[PDB]
Amino acid sequence: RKTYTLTDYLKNTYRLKLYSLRWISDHEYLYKQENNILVFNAEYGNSSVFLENSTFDEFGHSINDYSISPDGQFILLEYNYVKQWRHSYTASYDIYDLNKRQLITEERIPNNTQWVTWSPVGHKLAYVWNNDIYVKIEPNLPSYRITWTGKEDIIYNGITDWVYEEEVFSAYSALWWSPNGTFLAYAQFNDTEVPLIEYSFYSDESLQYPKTVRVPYPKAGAVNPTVKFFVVNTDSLSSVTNATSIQITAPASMLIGDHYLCDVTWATQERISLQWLRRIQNYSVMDICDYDESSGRWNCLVARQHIEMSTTGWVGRFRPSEPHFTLDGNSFYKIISNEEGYRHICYFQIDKKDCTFITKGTWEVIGIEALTSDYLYYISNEYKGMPGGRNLYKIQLSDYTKVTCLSCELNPERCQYYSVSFSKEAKYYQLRCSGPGLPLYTLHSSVNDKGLRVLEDNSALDKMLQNVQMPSKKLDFIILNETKFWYQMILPPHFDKSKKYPLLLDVYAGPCSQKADTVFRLNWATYLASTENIIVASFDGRGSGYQGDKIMHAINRRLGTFEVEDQIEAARQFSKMGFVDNKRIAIWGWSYGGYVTSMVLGSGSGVFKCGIAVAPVSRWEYYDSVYTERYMGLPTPEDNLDHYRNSTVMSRAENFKQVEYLLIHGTADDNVHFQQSAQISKALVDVGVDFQAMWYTDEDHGIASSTAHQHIYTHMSHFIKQCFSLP
Amino acid sequence: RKTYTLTDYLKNTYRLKLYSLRWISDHEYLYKQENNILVFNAEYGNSSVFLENSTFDEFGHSINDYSISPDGQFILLEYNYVKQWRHSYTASYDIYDLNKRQLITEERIPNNTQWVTWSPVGHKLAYVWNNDIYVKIEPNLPSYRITWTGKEDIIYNGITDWVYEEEVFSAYSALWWSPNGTFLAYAQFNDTEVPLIEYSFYSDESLQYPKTVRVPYPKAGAVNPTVKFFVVNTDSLSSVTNATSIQITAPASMLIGDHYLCDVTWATQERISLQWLRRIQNYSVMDICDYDESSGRWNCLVARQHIEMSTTGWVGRFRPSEPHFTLDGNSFYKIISNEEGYRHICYFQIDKKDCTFITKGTWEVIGIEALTSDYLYYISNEYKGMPGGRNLYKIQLSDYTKVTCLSCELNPERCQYYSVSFSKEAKYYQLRCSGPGLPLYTLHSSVNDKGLRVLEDNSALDKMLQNVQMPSKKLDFIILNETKFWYQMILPPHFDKSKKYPLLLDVYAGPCSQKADTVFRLNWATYLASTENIIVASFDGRGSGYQGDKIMHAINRRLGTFEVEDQIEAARQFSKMGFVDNKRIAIWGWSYGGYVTSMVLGSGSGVFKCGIAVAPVSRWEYYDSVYTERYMGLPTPEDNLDHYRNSTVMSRAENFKQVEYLLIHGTADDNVHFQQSAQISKALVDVGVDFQAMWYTDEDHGIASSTAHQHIYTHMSHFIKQCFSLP
Ligand SMILES: *[C@@H]1O[C@H](CO)[C@@H](O[C@@H]2O[C@H](CO)[C@@H](O)[C@H](O)[C@H]2NC(C)=O)[C@H](O)[C@H]1NC(C)=O
Ligand SMILES: *[C@@H]1O[C@H](CO)[C@@H](O[C@@H]2O[C@H](CO)[C@@H](O)[C@H](O)[C@H]2NC(C)=O)[C@H](O)[C@H]1NC(C)=O
Ligand SMILES: Cc1nc2nc(C(=O)N3CCOCC3)cn2c(-c2ccc(Cl)cc2Cl)c1CN
Ligand SMILES: Cc1nc2nc(C(=O)N3CCOCC3)cn2c(-c2ccc(Cl)cc2Cl)c1CN
Ligand SMILES: *[C@@H]1O[C@H](CO)[C@@H](O)[C@H](O)[C@H]1NC(C)=O
Ligand SMILES: *[C@@H]1O[C@H](CO)[C@@H](O)[C@H](O)[C@H]1NC(C)=O
């Protein structure tokens, strides 16, 4: 009988099915079946073909994605896709009028467009091209140029520079339509004095001289980009006169120094919320800005700013939390750490002091998902006190005490990890369960929270997997200093506590991470347990998220300490349990996991026989400012420079003589620079330690090209199989 | 009897002693002994300390080198040495007045000087600083400025650019003083439009942003630097009037296209010899340029031009050979490829056409070493018919049939490979024997070729080696289509022709190379044979040198052809021999040896279990123009594009599934760019071939930092051991 093989992982032999739909009103959504775009009625479940796979067979280009105007009249077609960073890319665009069932060829959207977006209502367009912003009121009409300052690598209007995209907004876009669709707000980033990271890109075999890539990127403590914020009135645009952008300056308490613009939320048609963060990320201000028709200006009264501080750590999980505004725009809710350091929903009324906690407990809210007049819907990990689970709840607005669990009980053995998607105005919602069993997609009505229908049960995949000897998963915890810390273990088929198993510790362990959860996954570890009979453990130690600040801020200004310690201690704990071959314990990790794997390998602990680090950080001065400084402060003598340097992998080289080490990195890694590994290897050479290495030419942090993806996991499997003495 | 261990190799436990001297006159030389500089009388062997080690115990800096003027009045002190390429570097210099016994302290040689030389006689100096040439008539006097055009990375006056240094002059200098010291000849190079190679340098851990290094480097087919030649009269220099340098123009037959200046020789006080070469290294012209005392000009009579062509390949082994002039400068001798294709000594008389061969035979003259009115001395491989041996011969210039071997019989057992060093006017000479026994340096008088005395017999080392199981070398040959091809074999001690030994083929096989010779070496192979009982073999197949053009030019316009195939056939032959285990045959090479190893691993032969390539070329369009075009012509559709394209390693990628491959490259290789290994690995990943890699951070082609050196050989040693299942 057969197992989950490496070739299965690499080749996607057992495919997970999903069901991504796109809401388009409070009761209809779109969906693709055989590349036909169907539109669905949510209430009754009937559907029909919105767009036929047939159309565009003679288009000329392969179509990459699409977006429909709110008013259903038009559709955007995205082709010539060219990926840049984690979120950004350039592409070409066409517009198809639906009622005319024709393709528009007037005033077309330029090739190399960097970003396009419909207005929330109607058929307006805004797009960035050559770092400048443009606006078409209508798709067959000439665009109005809004900005003139766009300049490659220096001035960005309406799109983000590298660090904002990666660490602040999590997106390339820096444009925000007012709900009216009347205003276009946007940010401008200035990278004039931001230093450049430089690396070689070799390209095709045919490229005689390797090309040098230069990217404005601030490493820890280096000069940051600066930011301006503007708002333009789209209703008032002249063919003759320029477009007048009104600026909104940051609070004076931000203007005194380096800061970031970290969130932008429209409250009403004439109220905006701005979140600002001090470069020292323990202080931030929310600014409420109202339009004044008499002047045309936007004013943010100092009086109604809201303010957040931390004395134990930084602000928010990764940034200040997002405000969810009540419909009238006079109050809002948002996740906040309470007096005991747990993140709960807090209620804020604009011109009033403080805020009011509507939730509390020894658990945390993960996200606020929806807000109607009678209810606030949110995900939390309360159920059964399992930080690694997720369920939908709703709280009765007029009686905070009445909290209903919407998902806890749908299928309590198959489903303990939910996410959700609401329709406009929240009349219907889609539930998505991700484990511990097979992913399961259902539809629901808000009225009586009635289960309308099952959308996808992955029955087909399930029939296949009954054939294979699949691994099982154990989610438990252990006690350390009177504190529970959770772990998981993917266990091989027919597990036997009277046998001894080799064990791989799969590490990430970065701040607010969680590696022990109830998600079902078909991945490299599935192969390792199913086929090679290795146990694959992970452990959430100090610094991990979703358990309260006491645990999360343990690591404050002290990266490469308690999280490293704890992974080691976790392994001592596992050896204690009697079914692990304490001669065959490995450790591996990627990104931040690579850094921790290295530090572990470098600790002299004597627990680990061998390990793999992929694209690991090696010293924090090498990584970016927003991320690094968030946790480490600045690397100056008067701040945290000491620990910046007590915490490098390099300084641990000698101890690598006791272990077998595999070090991997892509040459075109724009995120964690090849530098970081290049310095690790040199430190190891310089001290006479033998080790094994692999570079991947022209790959970035993902090393995700199909061929490279296959090569590295193959390479790594050999490594581990040697180390463990397996066939 | 212990064994020769890797450590012995890396720690240099068993050291070869040398005897490096510089002839100072017709009868004395200098010799550094315990940081004491000594003068030695050749005839009697008596000495006197010229400069005590005690001096400069108070200097302030570590002193890297020294240079005493021809008149012994001053000495240059080189310190603050920084290495650039293979020959180039910059440094600081102090001058010490040997008479006044003190350091001159004004009008100093600037810091970061790029080159200095004394004139041939006296105490003039010429130097290069910021790519401009300056001249001091006396060490305390201010220097006159010869050129003003010097510009970093663009215009070089009196020093060479990257290719010229590496591939033409085998030196940084481009300064040639007339024998008087009267004139200063120099070249100027213009790399205006020469593309730049760019790569990352990671420096010490403290550097936060890596540096991009940028070097004008013409790759096969790209724009080449241009050159001009000038001569300045050193006596008529003015304090206010800018010195005037007279330009010599290359011959019309050279100006029609791209060309090189390949050699400069002063013939008399008033006659310069210049050799030029076409970018297509088919054709070269030697110009003879006389000074016109009235004119002030220099004239190059077309009738005097001596032309070398080749229809079978290129001119010269690596470049047209150096001419050796008679005292009166009216005639010269030059190594030339004869009608049978063997390189022999040719006698040229200035105003007469063609020339006369002074020697002949099926062997070759390697070098002309000295010239008097009575004798011409040269090194050749005639003795015992071995191309891999070297001997000093003299030929009576009044009767060419009268050749006598000066070294053949001194010590037939111990010595078969000599180099030599003559005093001026060749009154005496130092013989240096390199094997096959321990190195042995002797002094001799020309009068009757008497042996004067022994300088170094390496008896120290001999003593030490009496306690180690040393391996032996067999130097034999095989037949291939009726032609003899040589190889050598390092044989483990106590070699039993009955057993079967694993075999490592050590390859270079570049054009005009030679890996089978009679020289003594303590190297990696010594360790492998002695300690790990491996037979290390090397073979000189087609393309190799010192055996006639039929063999050397076989590879014309088809690198990665016969030399790759011949390495393969050699291996087969070696199997036939009943003492090699044909299941355990590996291969490895560096540089060209790296490319060949790759072509071989990727050929499909099934002969080799595994191989190592170190800094390999993989594609000839990536290597430089002077070396590459010499053998491949230009990479254009009209010339040799097809074979450029056919002889990439990348095209053989699939075949690598059959072998184990380790690929190694320094990230800072200015010579064979990392690009080349980056493209090999990408081809291997693209087609799903697994392999081993290792990059060396900030190392260059030589990978020679003491720590990198030790680390690469250790890494390589594990791999080889593993391949052969060696305990
Ligand atoms: C982006 O920021 C740069 C850097 O500060 C600005 O450049 C400066 O502009 C002022 C006014 O022109 C000058 O006085 C400075 O000398 C400039 N410094 C540099 C480094 O150039 C630039 O104006 C900003 N660009 C925009 C459009 O906001
Ligand atoms: C080095 O070579 C470059 C290219 O041949 C020369 O550049 C030219 O400069 C002259 C003016 O002296 C003009 O003919 C052109 O404007 C330039 N062309 C280019 C491509 O830049 C340059 O003159 C040379 N420098 C020296 C010292 O000879
Ligand atoms: C936005 C972001 N997303 C991420 N996903 C992973 C991830 O799980 N891995 C692990 C699995 O494979 C992909 C990366 C890591 N990151 C990081 C990140 C965090 C720390 C460091 Cl040191 C580097 C990065 Cl990129 C960042 C922040 N830039
Ligand atoms: C001036 C020169 N000297 C060299 N010595 C070696 C050598 O023997 N090995 C011995 C083994 O160690 C490496 C160098 C190789 N080269 C080459 C050379 C030739 C071809 C290529 Cl592809 C690269 C180089 Cl550097 C060049 C000219 N570039
Ligand atoms: C669903 O059916 C209703 C009633 O026939 C119809 O009006 C509506 O257009 C249908 N919607 C879809 C998505 O087909
Ligand atoms: C996009 O570029 C291609 C040619 O590269 C062309 O077919 C098309 O017309 C361009 N689109 C626009 C908006 O100009």
Ligand SMILES: *[C@@H]1O[C@H](CO)[C@@H](O)[C@H](O)[C@H]1NC(C)=O
């Ligand atoms: C939207 O709100 C703005 C702000 O007052 C107002 O000026 C505008 O008329 C509104 N737009 C539309 C199209 O209703």
Ligand SMILES: *[C@@H]1O[C@H](CO)[C@@H](O)[C@H](O)[C@H]1NC(C)=O
């Ligand atoms: C437990 O406390 C000890 C100090 O007494 C400390 O060494 C260790 O890090 C702690 N462990 C955890 C995981 O809290």
Ligand SMILES: *[C@@H]1O[C@H](CO)[C@@H](O)[C@H](O)[C@H]1NC(C)=O
């Ligand atoms: C100086 O010379 C003496 C021999 O005369 C030698 O013994 C001593 O080591 C030398 N000092 C050095 C090498 O600095």
Ligand SMILES: *[C@@H]1O[C@H](CO)[C@@H](O)[C@H](O)[C@H]1NC(C)=O
């Ligand atoms: C060697 O000895 C002779 C005879 O005294 C002397 O003239 C000569 O200068 C000496 N040479 C050296 C280098 O000491």
Ligand SMILES: *[C@@H]1O[C@H](CO)[C@@H](O)[C@H](O)[C@H]1NC(C)=O
């Ligand atoms: C060297 O030769 C040049 C040219 O013949 C002449 O001008 C000069 O006087 C000579 N130098 C000496 C010092 O003999």
Ligand SMILES: *[C@@H]1O[C@H](CO)[C@@H](O)[C@H](O)[C@H]1NC(C)=O
């Ligand atoms: C000799 O002939 C063989 C036959 O296989 C051929 O492959 C090879 O190229 C030839 N070698 C020489 C030395 O010409």
Ligand SMILES: *[C@H]1O[C@H](CO)[C@@H](O)[C@H](O)[C@H]1NC(C)=O
């Ligand atoms: C060279 O600079 C060094 C210090 O870097 C200094 O001692 C000296 O004055 C300089 N020498 C000259 C003459 O340029």
